[PDB]
Each structure stands twice: as C-alpha cells, then as structure tokens.
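Agenda item 2: zinc ion complex prediction
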Amino acid sequence: TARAVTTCRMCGAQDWQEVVDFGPVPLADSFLEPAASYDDEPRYPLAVVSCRSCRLMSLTHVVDPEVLYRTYPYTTSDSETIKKHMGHVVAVCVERFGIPEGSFVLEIGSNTGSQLKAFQNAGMRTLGIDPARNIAAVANERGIETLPEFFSVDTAALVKKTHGTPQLVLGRHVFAHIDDVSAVAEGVRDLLGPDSLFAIEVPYLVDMLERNEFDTIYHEHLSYIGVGSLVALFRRHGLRVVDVERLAVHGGSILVFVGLDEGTRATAPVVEELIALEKERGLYEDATYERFARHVAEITAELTSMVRSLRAEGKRIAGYGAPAKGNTLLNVCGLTADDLEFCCDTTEFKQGLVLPGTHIPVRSPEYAKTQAIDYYLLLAWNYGEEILAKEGPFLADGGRFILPNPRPSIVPPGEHHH
Ligand SMILES: Cc1cn([C@H]2C[C@H](O)[C@@H](COP(=O)(O)OP(=O)(O)O[C@@H]3C[C@@H](O)C(=O)[C@@H](C)O3)O2)c(=O)[nH]c1=O
Ligand SMILES: Nc1ncnc2c1ncn2[C@@H]1O[C@H](CSCC[C@H](N)C(=O)O)[C@@H](O)[C@H]1O
Ligand SMILES: [Zn+2]
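Presented output:
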C-alpha cells in the first residue's frame, strides 16, 4: 500500500484543502502484457490537496519509490523538442552563470544520460545519479557514469569524497517525484561550494492551473510546484532562490536556480516578480482550487461525450502517443478499447503492450499508418508543434486531432488565425 501524507513536504505545516479526488487509479507507467483478465492489477488512491501555508499542491499519498523507479520504462525523449531544450539548458546554465570549461556537473535523475552528454560536449565533467538500474546500466555502457541509487544525504557525501565539489547540481523533472525534499536540500547544501548552483526543472503550478492540465496528476508526481513553496523550503536549509526561467516544455515549466544563502550568487529581481505574480493570480485563495476542480469536471465530461458522439456517428478514434499523463486522462474519463481502438507510440518497449486500467492496446506508428483513423486524441500534447509538423499527410487526407487543454478543441481549426 501507499503511505499517507501527514505534514507538508516544503513548509512543514498541516493545513490543506481538498481540490480533487479521482479515487483508486492504476500506476501510470505500469504497462501490462495482453491477457485474458486483469483482476490483480494494483490501484492506489489518486487525490490532490493544497497546503494553505505555502500552497504546495500535493498528492494525499506516496507510492513506494522502490516500486516506481527501480525498473523504470521511460527513457528521456529523443524528440527534436527535447534535444533542442537540453542544448538550451546547457546554454542557460553556462552563459548566465559563467561556468568555465572543465567544471563538474552532477545530475540527479539523469536517466539515459542525454542531458549529461550535452554538458560533456560543452566541455564539462559529469556524474549521474538515477535509481533505475536498467536505465542506469545503459547510460554507463554508453560512457556516461551514473550511480544506480536514489539521491540522499549519504550519496551526496560519497560524491563529494570521490568526485569533489560540483559547480552545478541539476535535477530535471525529478524534484516533484521525491517525497523527502528536506533530505534533498540537505545533501545539496553539503555538496555546494560558495558559488555553486542547484538547478531544478519542474512543471509550473501556475501553468497547470490556468491550462487545466489535470492529466499531469499521477502517482509519480507527488508535488505540483510554484516558486513561493520552494522559497519556503530552501529558507529552512540555508539555501536561497537566485533565479527562475519560465519554459514552454512539458505544459509550462520553471527552471529554478538555487545557491547557498551566504554565497556569491546574488538574488535576481525575477524571483520576487514571480512570487508577486502567483499571489496576483489567486494561488493563495481557496476559490482558485475549487474553480480548478469544476474545470476538470467540465473538461472530463466534454471530452468523453465528444469521443462517444463521434464514435456513434461511425468515426474511428485512436490515441496519439502513450505517455504517463495519457493514462490519467483515459482512466479519469472512463474510456475503453471501445472508445479508442489503440494508442500509437514510438517507444518500442510500449509496443505490443496494453495501457493500465483502460487496457487499450499500444501499437507502432507503422501499424497506425495502415489504419483509416478519423480522429486522434492527442495524448502527447506537450509535443504538439513537433507532432503536427510531421503529420501533413494525415491532415491533408481530412484527419483531425482532439486536444484536451486548455479547453478541448479540434485541429485543424475552422479558420486561419491572422
Ligand atoms: C513526440 C512523440 C512522443 N511520442 C510518445 C513517446 C512517449 O512515450 C510519449 C510522450 O511522453 P512524455 O515524454 O510526454 O512523458 P510522460 O510519459 O508523460 O512522462 C514522463 C515521466 C514523468 O515522470 C515526467 O516527469 C515526464 C517529464 O516524463 O509519447 C510519440 O509516440 N510520438 C511522438 O512523436
Ligand atoms: N530520489 C531520486 N533520486 C534520483 N533520481 C530519481 C529519484 N527518484 C526518481 N528518480 C529518477 O528520475 C527520473 C524521472 S523521469 C525524468 C528523466 C529525465 N531527467 C528527463 O527529463 O527526461 C527517472 O529516471 C527516475 O528513475
Ligand atoms: Zn506547505
């Protein structure tokens, strides 16, 4: 079973409002072999709450990280969107903060090592930390040194002893996956020198709310983060937020830079600005989260009826992509193999398997091209630009996409915009 949350991860208070509850839901990255029955498929409570002190949004429960990550199926995206963005991460970290060549970059949640490879090509030393043993072994084989463990205070000490003081510690879409964020901040403080930086990239709570990105809620994502809550945490561990860049990736994200409170790095005015913008946008008020809750109910209702109405007219519908978030979407909406006949996915591992809960088949893009699909529900919507750019033939044949946010809509639109 999953361990229930008591006190807030960031600020340590215990006062939260309920925002939305999806009940028991299977794990989003637990894909299954095709079978006759799925009676013993595990399901865990999926519900979110909002801490009134610092306004961290969090799940009510914490699924065991040993269960989630020790055999992880998701390798870092090989898309042009992520290749480009990884290059941009290097550029921002190096040029904005003046990190010299030959400097040491440690990455938490380094996965296959693609992001570290980009730092190596820019002239840096690297080391990765990732508990996914299968994925860690690939990174190591490829020449990118990765410790096959979770980040911790003692792993941080091992790194300092064996590899030294890093100029940069990086965590991309891992910080919201960790329960004991307090221990992460502590290991970071010990690791950082006076001008070292800790950088985390996470989905931005502001974008999540304004765009109704409820499908990004799943068990791996324990936290849903705004800048305010991060300041509340780092305050308590001798750390200080010095810079933030807003990013279009993964539905709107923030790349946050953190240094030692008594260190070289001055605080940029942008930090105060975003904290003021979060207040200004109603993040510290109960109404905003009840508004989010009904938006979700409306979108869920509208998405299901849109799909079932089209099917009733004799239209064929499939899913485009089989991302983790897609599985939250389809389970909450209650869609099945009768509504979507398959989900196409470029991930070889996922091909020939079946989605969690809904049990919809995952097929290859080359199979998908043989089938006369009328509509694709765009589950991998965070790659919307790249996907639409290469689906000209489908679109020219009268094919259409259904996008789930900010509001459900049909691509192509009825008119050109401009
Ligand atoms: C761009 C593209 C993706 N895909 C597939 C590959 C992937 O399985 C899926 C996209 O998954 P995506 O990268 O959005 O990630 P998700 O599977 O949604 O989530 C993973 C793990 C999660 O913990 C996290 O933090 C985020 C950042 O990453 O869609 C295609 O089939 N065709 C495409 O053209
Ligand atoms: N406590 C922890 N310490 C280090 N890595 C962790 C962790 N918990 C989860 N992870 C790893 O973090 C990754 C989350 S997915 C993000 C992968 C990569 N940074 C990318 O953006 O593509 C997984 O590889 C998972 O194994
Ligand atoms: Zn809090």
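Discussion summary: The radius of gyration is 22 Å.
Owner for follow-up: CH.
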